[PDB]
Amino acid sequence: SKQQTSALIHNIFDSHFAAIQIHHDSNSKSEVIRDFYTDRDTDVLNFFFLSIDQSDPSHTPEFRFLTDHKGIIWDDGNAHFYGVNDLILDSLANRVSFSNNWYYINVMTSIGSRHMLVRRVPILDPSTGEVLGFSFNAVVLDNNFALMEKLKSESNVDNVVLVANSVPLANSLIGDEPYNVADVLQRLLVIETPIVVNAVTTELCLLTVQ
Amino acid sequence: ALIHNIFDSHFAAIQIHHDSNSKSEVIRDFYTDRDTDVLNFFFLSIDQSDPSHTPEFRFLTDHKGIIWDDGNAHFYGVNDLILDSLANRVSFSNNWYYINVMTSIGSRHMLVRRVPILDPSTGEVLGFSFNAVVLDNNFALMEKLKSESNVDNVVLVANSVPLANSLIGDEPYNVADVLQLLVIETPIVVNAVTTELCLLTVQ
Amino acid sequence: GYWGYQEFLDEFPEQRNLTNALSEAVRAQPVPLSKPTQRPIKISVVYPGQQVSDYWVRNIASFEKRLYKLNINYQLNQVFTRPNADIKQQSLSLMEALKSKSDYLIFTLDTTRHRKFVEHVLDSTNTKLILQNITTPVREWDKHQPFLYVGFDHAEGSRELATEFGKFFPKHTYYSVLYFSEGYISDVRGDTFIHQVNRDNNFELQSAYYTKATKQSGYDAAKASLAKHPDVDFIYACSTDVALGAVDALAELGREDIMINGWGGGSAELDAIQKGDLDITVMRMNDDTGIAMAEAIKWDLEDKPVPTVYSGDFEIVTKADSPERIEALKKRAFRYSDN
Amino acid sequence: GYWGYQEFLDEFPEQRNLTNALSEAVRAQPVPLSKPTQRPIKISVVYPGQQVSDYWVRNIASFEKRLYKLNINYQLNQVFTRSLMEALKSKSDYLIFTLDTTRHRKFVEHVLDSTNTKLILQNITTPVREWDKHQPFLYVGFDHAEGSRELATEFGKFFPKHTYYSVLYFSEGYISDVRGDTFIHQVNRDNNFELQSAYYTKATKQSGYDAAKASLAKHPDVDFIYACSTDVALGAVDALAELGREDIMINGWGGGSAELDAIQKGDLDITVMRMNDDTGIAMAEAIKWDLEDKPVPTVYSGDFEIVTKADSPERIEALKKRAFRYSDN
Numbered sequence A: 001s002k003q004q005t006s007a008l009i010h011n012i013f014d015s016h017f018a019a020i021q022i023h024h025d026s027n028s029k030s031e032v033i034r035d036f037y038t039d040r041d042t043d044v045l046n047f048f049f050l051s052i053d054q055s056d057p058s059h060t061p062e063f064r065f066l067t068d069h070k071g072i073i074w075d076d077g078n079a080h081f082y083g084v085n086d087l088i089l090d091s092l093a094n095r096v097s098f099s100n101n102w103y104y105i106n107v108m109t110s111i112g113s114r115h116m117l118v119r120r121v122p123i124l125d126p127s128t129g130e131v132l133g134f135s136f137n138a139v140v141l142d143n144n145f146a147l148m149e150k151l152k153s154e155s156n157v158d159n160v161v162l163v164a165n166s167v168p169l170a171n172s173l174i175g176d177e178p179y180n181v182a183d184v185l186q187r188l189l190v191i192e193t194p195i196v197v198n199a200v201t202t203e204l205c206l207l208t209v210q
Numbered sequence B: 001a002l003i004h005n006i007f008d009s010h011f012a013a014i015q016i017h018h019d020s021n022s023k024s025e026v027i028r029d030f031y032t033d034r035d036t037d038v039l040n041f042f043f044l045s046i047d048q049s050d051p052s053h054t055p056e057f058r059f060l061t062d063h064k065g066i067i068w069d070d071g072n073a074h075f076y077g078v079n080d081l082i083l084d085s086l087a088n089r090v091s092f093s094n095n096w097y098y099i100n101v102m103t104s105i106g107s108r109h110m111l112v113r114r115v116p117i118l119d120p121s122t123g124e125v126l127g128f129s130f131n132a133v134v135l136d137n138n139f140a141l142m143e144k145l146k147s148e149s150n151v152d153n154v155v156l157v158a159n160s161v162p163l164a165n166s167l168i169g170d171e172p173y174n175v176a177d178v179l180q181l182l183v184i185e186t187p188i189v190v191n192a193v194t195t196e197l198c199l200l201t202v203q
Numbered sequence C: 001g002y003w004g005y006q007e008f009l010d011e012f013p014e015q016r017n018l019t020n021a022l023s024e025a026v027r028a029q030p031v032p033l034s035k036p037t038q039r040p041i042k043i044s045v046v047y048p049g050q051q052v053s054d055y056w057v058r059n060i061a062s063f064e065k066r067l068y069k070l071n072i073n074y075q076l077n078q079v080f081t082r083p084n085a086d087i088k089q090q091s092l093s094l095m096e097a098l099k100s101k102s103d104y105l106i107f108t109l110d111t112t113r114h115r116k117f118v119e120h121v122l123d124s125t126n127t128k129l130i131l132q133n134i135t136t137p138v139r140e141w142d143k144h145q146p147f148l149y150v151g152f153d154h155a156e157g158s159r160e161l162a163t164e165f166g167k168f169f170p171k172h173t174y175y176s177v178l179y180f181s182e183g184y185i186s187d188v189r190g191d192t193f194i195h196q197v198n199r200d201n202n203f204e205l206q207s208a209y210y211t212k213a214t215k216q217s218g219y220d221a222a223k224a225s226l227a228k229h230p231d232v233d234f235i236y237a238c239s240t241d242v243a244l245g246a247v248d249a250l251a252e253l254g255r256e257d258i259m260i261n262g263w264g265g266g267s268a269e270l271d272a273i274q275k276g277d278l279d280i281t282v283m284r285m286n287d288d289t290g291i292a293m294a295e296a297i298k299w300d301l302e303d304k305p306v307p308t309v310y311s312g313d314f315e316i317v318t319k320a321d322s323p324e325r326i327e328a329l330k331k332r333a334f335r336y337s338d339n
Numbered sequence D: 001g002y003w004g005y006q007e008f009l010d011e012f013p014e015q016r017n018l019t020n021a022l023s024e025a026v027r028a029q030p031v032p033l034s035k036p037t038q039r040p041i042k043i044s045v046v047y048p049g050q051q052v053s054d055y056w057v058r059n060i061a062s063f064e065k066r067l068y069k070l071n072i073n074y075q076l077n078q079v080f081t082r083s084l085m086e087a088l089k090s091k092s093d094y095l096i097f098t099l100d101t102t103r104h105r106k107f108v109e110h111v112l113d114s115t116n117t118k119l120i121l122q123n124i125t126t127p128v129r130e131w132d133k134h135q136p137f138l139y140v141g142f143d144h145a146e147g148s149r150e151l152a153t154e155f156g157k158f159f160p161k162h163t164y165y166s167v168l169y170f171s172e173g174y175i176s177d178v179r180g181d182t183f184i185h186q187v188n189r190d191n192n193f194e195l196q197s198a199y200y201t202k203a204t205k206q207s208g209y210d211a212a213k214a215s216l217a218k219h220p221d222v223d224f225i226y227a228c229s230t231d232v233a234l235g236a237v238d239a240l241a242e243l244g245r246e247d248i249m250i251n252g253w254g255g256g257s258a259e260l261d262a263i264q265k266g267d268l269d270i271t272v273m274r275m276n277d278d279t280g281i282a283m284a285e286a287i288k289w290d291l292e293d294k295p296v297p298t299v300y301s302g303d304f305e306i307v308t309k310a311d312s313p314e315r316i317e318a319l320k321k322r323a324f325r326y327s328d329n
């Protein structure tokens, strides 16, 4: 059923981000992160994130950063790879004005547009309830191999293409099939599943092939 | 509709908790002072706070051997000798291992993983923390798999042999009827490797 | 998950043959390119080469030489960083390599950080990927594998060191381990050794430290370790810089009773070997992984199949080796890079 | 996700129609029940309680009085919280609860998915987007975001750009987001105000006190503190007295009796005063329409008035007249 595949696909997408969000919530309660606001010891912070990403590769964000109440105080250096310079990072920080929610963000970079899910979480001092600042996680959807492989593998469809309106942003095509991505875009059982973030439908669609 | 996603999601949840807990000052401190009451309560907090995502047993090692386990292991047939071989079998960290072992009360099908306990300032490895899920007669997991996938019943099978099921005992069929009514087969993949494990759903 | 090197070649017999073929071409004298190209190929290298270890310096020297001797017309952009440092430079260099649509991007895979970058380059339309210093294909990437994984198998080299310490020392020997930073290297060099030594000789690990992959970091972890556990007969180090840092630590504490290994056997390690400061190392036949890359690129240009993976070989070297043995190993190892 | 109150009404023209009709009924004299019932209707209420804020207490008094005036036959049983399980069993016709924590979500979802009880959610006026299939019978309250925007507009007048302030949140959850982060965002966007510090509290006068001390001991240099609830505001008033920092302006949130007394002493500078009794009256009118088989709007928000310490005792008295028309008797 076309609607049963569509529901399956959105459950997989949703549970991938629900796990990244659980992970982010949990690691954000670390004393190392808390203490960084006082110590500003960057060696300790980096070792800590190195350690949790080694523990969990499939749930690590593409990039992350820390703010206080004025601005970004630390970034992990990964965002630059994706065309996200300091300026664009700030704009991300400023677009995510509420905690505990994924935001879909489409920004232009010098290497093209970037399609991201970004969320923030407060870093508290548990003895005072002080909000020291915020931890951000961004997932870059563009050429996101692991997510395309999850959607394909756990739905048992043959291939997936992620599109923004209908520019292709990622796909699971090996290159040995009867069709390319352009053929898929030209609307043999291809199904459109719209991507919903924070209960609001975005410009993104998942296209499944069977 | 797929139990595959729900299954994997469940073990990903367990893993996320384990990774996070192992970074706790509580576990690091236990290496030095061995306050088994503090530790046991720490894990009680987490367990009753999330009864759905908790290992059937836990243990801690230092480089010499096992320094603590939660008491649960022996009830599954996992005696001290077998616990010890589990520790040595799981020789890389951060990865699930599918282990099947003979115990005195029957074959045991498990997923085991370990994570190093580190001093975040010195870089010292104090030891390792393990989590194990016993798959045999795991009713709660079978119940979670059944309700979250909206199927009528679930049977877990290790190489054509049943080891857990969600059957109530009143339905117009038994587990034997399931192995030869719409049944679907979903094999389990562990650490990128397809296992002998298979989930059989009924509608 | 990763495939073991032999495991991967045994699983795909066709890959064994491709790899075998590549080893022959690396061993044999250069057969120049048989299909000239309409423009130079664009090669980008992003390596953690700013180390006391000359592995990465020599890997590129030998690669370029072979590209030259193969009459391959190329341009090479080369960026070297420190391990765990120059993070922004590293992300920028990778970005610039993809932006300028390099034909080949030569990189590495130790951490989740590297993995995420590589996952974003896998479906690339323009850039092929060579991952240096890894020879264990990622299972999840089957059917979307990079152009080449190339290196000296970490496990094999750790197995060889483990066998040798197994013979030097009696059962239940006490040792400590100085890992690299967290990641693939520490897992395949360090945990491989620990595992084999524990099950075969009942050696007893007294302490282990992750480090920052530097000399200073090795010095500091060695001092901290021996402060808590002075009663060890050896220290297993997972990398060159870490090992040489530990060397300074044992001297500062007057402790060359403790045996310490190197890992790799480049120039600085060889000097420390012949000087008596390192007791043992696993020596890589270095230049073969630079050469294999040039040969792999030649094959791609002549439209031939290229193996997914290539590992070079080691020789064991001790402080009791003659100046004759070393010199002859150096002529094998540094055949292009010394010349 | 949540719809904004006006956003929801704009999205669903039928829902605006229905909310307007309810606002009007609330405004006009009680028109008693057309369809008499077979039994007395059963209502369970589960409210916070033990609060300096009189919102919940007054809400029940306003509700019962309008129920009496419409000639509804009810058995009202109430619980104030220092078990939602103990409430489930009683098989009521209307359950009145609230939604702030993920713990409330878990329950509401269970009540919506596995019961017949018509659910009224008090102190939330922003419909959950994921429940567009089966929305609660009524979301009723005074819109948190609207009240915060009003407080923000006022502060934006009293202080020049780049002014320093701190924030005392409620406890973590929905109230903190829609009162606190709404205020923070507007004042930052519009007035270039600069936030020095923010603290989550335990939603008590005690923790309001403690948080302000902690805040001022670490960031003494603010011109105002924005508080997100009544009890937290009044705790912070004490802390300011104790530290002798009445140079620091502070707000109330709700404008109940205790806030009004504090306003009149100049302990509170400003508050956003809600026309309190309207939401007690709305719930009665909503129950009546249900009993008359009439459609009932998903969402109802009452109105606010801005109150400052400069206001006449006559202005205050005329507001107490409208706001507590029922619960003052």
Ligand SMILES: C[C@]12OC[C@H](O)[C@@]1(O)O[B-](O)(O)O2
Residues within 6 Å of the ligand: C048, C051, C053, C054, C055, C056, C083, C133, C185, C238, C239, C240, C241, C263, C264, C265, C266
């Ligand atoms: C190549 C190399 O791997 C890790 C580190 O980068 C290294 O240069 O150090 B070493 O020479 O031990 O081997």
Ligand SMILES: C[C@]12OC[C@H](O)[C@@]1(O)O[B-](O)(O)O2
Residues within 6 Å of the ligand: D048, D051, D053, D054, D055, D056, D123, D175, D228, D229, D230, D231, D253, D254, D255, D256
């Ligand atoms: C109704 C109310 O919401 C939060 C808290 O419960 C409260 O009673 O306190 B308050 O008057 O600020 O508003």
